[PDB]
Design a protein around this nucleic acid. Structure first.
Ligand code: AMP
Length: 529
RNA sequence: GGGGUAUCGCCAAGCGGUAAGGCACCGGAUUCUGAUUCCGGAGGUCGAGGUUCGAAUCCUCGUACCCCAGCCA
């Protein structure tokens, strides 16, 4: 429960409603992100819990900011998240003829007029946050003049900027949006749905309430910036022949630490190529979180956990992470990899290797076990071996043992380095029978696995507030480590996510893992205190 | 000017009855993942009043922060 669900209950009880019908209206001007996941869960979830319906409407009243590529994707992630919309996919453009008819009703009703003030002029006549606005000189044309002038616009008689249809409200209203907000503006551009049928397009406020009304939306849910805008939402409906009046309710938008949500900023990262695509694993997009290896179920859990309120908030990464962890920790099977390898060599070992039985999930034996190749020329991660240091350091020391993963307790007893004092091999002796702890991969059967380590895209918690958010990117957001993993991973499949023991949770894909180079994405590392 | 919001570190409940819940942090128990799991702790109701037996919840004066001056959504 949250404040919106309480309002829904009150109405259901008060008989104000007999069903709930919500909607998710993204403008197809970019890809969906974690913020849209919060909105998708709210709207689609509410509907399903309340045995109602929820529509997917692409608010496409601005041909110049949107592309078909986006509608294609939006649909994809909405589904991938586990949500189904009611009936066909909608579009504001479907109501483009209804809206025109409504603009004409307002006009006939004397509530709208073709203004001819330039764009700089409408701003000048607009007033300020404290000083009131002033009436346009064209404010009082006749219904005949307005009808005539509107069609003129529609026909293409007027140049872009040369004219716009305005609502005749109150130029001194403390609500700046009520200062004769524009209803229709001229754009000689092609629409991705209506082609070049319309040379005039409707503004958001005009289109939103009407679409909502036509679809029969009971509760229009949106973010807080549209609180003032609600005044125009109710005015439009109140002033036209429409049989329903959907009610708007605003909730705070999600803000995530070390990342940016603005489609404009996200777009920029994508435009300027500072990230691969909208699906780059460091992007907070849905396709991004997906390619990174997040589970729709973990996102829905995230959104569920963060709550819905009217308070500006900024969730820490830690929370998002806890979510994929709590999922993957229980469903992912363990594996063995070495991101930064250093060849160990048990001179004490004789043979061409053998095989050791390993589990698929330590606390879940019913997930089965497996056979893995052992040898005297195995690899380990550098950080595991230490020539010296502390009484807490539970790994390999230049004079002690350690239990290799699911295998033998080796015991270092030498080493060797190169011209730059960098080790190359570590000579140790395996206890004939033993089967701190560490993880390995035999060199003989070591698949050359490219491992991709991801980190926070930005170096500052609130990059958005930075003067140049781009200049504050994290150069180590993606560190590509070539490594070695067990031959098991020879049979990985994009979609499947395993937990490389002791490291993190990894998954294939990343748009790169060919048959030769199995590239892997590190979804999230483990709690490492 | 107008619209909103103020509960530990971050989120966020109890809506007149006396500080949930998640995440973060800090300790202890197990674990061939320093993980998991498991107990234990630290910290909070903007300020100043009023009402009340009692207020986080109602009333008020402050103050702080956010949004609004796109022919963007
Ligand atoms: N950062 C965000 N947090 C929460 N909801 C968001 C966020 N960004 C967009 N939305 C929701 O997604 C809808 C469609 O967004 P557009 O594509 O701008 C909005 O009307 C909001 O309900």
């Amino acid at each position: 429960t949250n404040f919106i669900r309480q309002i829904i209950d009150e109405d259901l009880a008060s008989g104000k409603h007999t069903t709930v019908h919500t909607r998710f209206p993204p403008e197809p001007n970019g890809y969906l992100h974690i913020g849209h996941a919060k909105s998708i869960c709210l709207n689609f979830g509410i509907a399903q819990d309340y045995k109602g319906q929820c529509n997917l409407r692409f608010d496409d009243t601005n041909p110049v900011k949107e592309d078909i590529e986006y509608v294609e994707s939006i649909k994809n992630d909405v589904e991938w998240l586990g949500f189904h919309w009611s009936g066909n996919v909608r579009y504001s453009s479907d109501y483009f003829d209804q809206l025109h008819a409504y603009a004409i009703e307002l006009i006939n009703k004397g509530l709208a007029y073709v203004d001819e003030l330039t764009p700089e002029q409408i701003r000048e006549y607009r007033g300020t946050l404290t000083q009131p606005g002033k009436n346009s000189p064209y404010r009082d044309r006749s219904v005949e003049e307005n009808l005539a002038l509107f069609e003129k616009m529609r026909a293409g008689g007027f140049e872009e900027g040369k004219a716009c249809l305005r609502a005749k409200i109150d130029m001194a209203s403390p609500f700046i949006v009520m200062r004769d907000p524009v209803l229709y503006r001229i754009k000689f551009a092609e629409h991705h749905q209506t082609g070049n049928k319309w040379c005039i397009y409707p503004m958001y406020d005009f289109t939103h309430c009407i679409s909502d009304a036509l679809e029969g939306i009971t509760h229009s849910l949106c973010t807080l910036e549209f609180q003032d805008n609600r005044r125009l939402y109710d005015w439009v409906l109140d002033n036209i022949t429409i049989p329903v009046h959907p009610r708007q309710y605003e909730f705070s938008r999600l803000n995530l630490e070390y990342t940016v949500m603005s489609k404009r900023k996200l777009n920029l990262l994508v435009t300027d190529k500072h990230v691969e695509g909208w699906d780059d694993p460091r992007m907070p997009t849905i396709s991004g979180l997906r390619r990174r290896g997040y589970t729709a179920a973990s996102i829905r859990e995230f959104c569920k956990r963060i709550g819905v309120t009217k308070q500006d908030n900024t969730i820490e990464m830690a929370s998002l992470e806890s979510c994929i962890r709590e999922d993957l920790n229980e469903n992912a099977p363990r594996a063995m990899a070495v991101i930064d390898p250093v060849k160990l060599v048990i001179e004490n070992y004789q043979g061409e290797g053998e095989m050791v039985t390993m589990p698929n999930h330590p606390n879940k034996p019913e997930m089965g076990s497996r056979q893995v190749p052992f040898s005297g020329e195995i690899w380990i991660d550098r950080a595991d071996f230490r020539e010296e240091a502390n009484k807490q350091y539970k790994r390999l020391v230049l004079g002690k043992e350690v239990r290799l993963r699911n295998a033998y307790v080796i015991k270092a007893e030498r080493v060797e380095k190169d011209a730059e004092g960098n080790i190359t091999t570590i000579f140790c002796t395996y206890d004939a029978d033993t089967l701190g702890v560490i993880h390995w991969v035999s060199a003989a059967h070591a698949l050359p696995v490219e491992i991709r380590l991801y980190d926070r895209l930005f170096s500052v918690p609130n990059p958005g507030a930075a003067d140049d958010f781009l200049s504050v990117i994290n150069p180590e957001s993606l560190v590509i480590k070539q490594g070695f993993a067990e031959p098991s991973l020879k049979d990985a499949v994009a979609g499947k996510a395993f937990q490389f023991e002791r490291e993190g949770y990894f998954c294939l894909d990343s748009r790169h893992s060919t048959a030769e180079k199995p590239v892997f994405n590190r979804t999230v590392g483990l709690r490492d205190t």
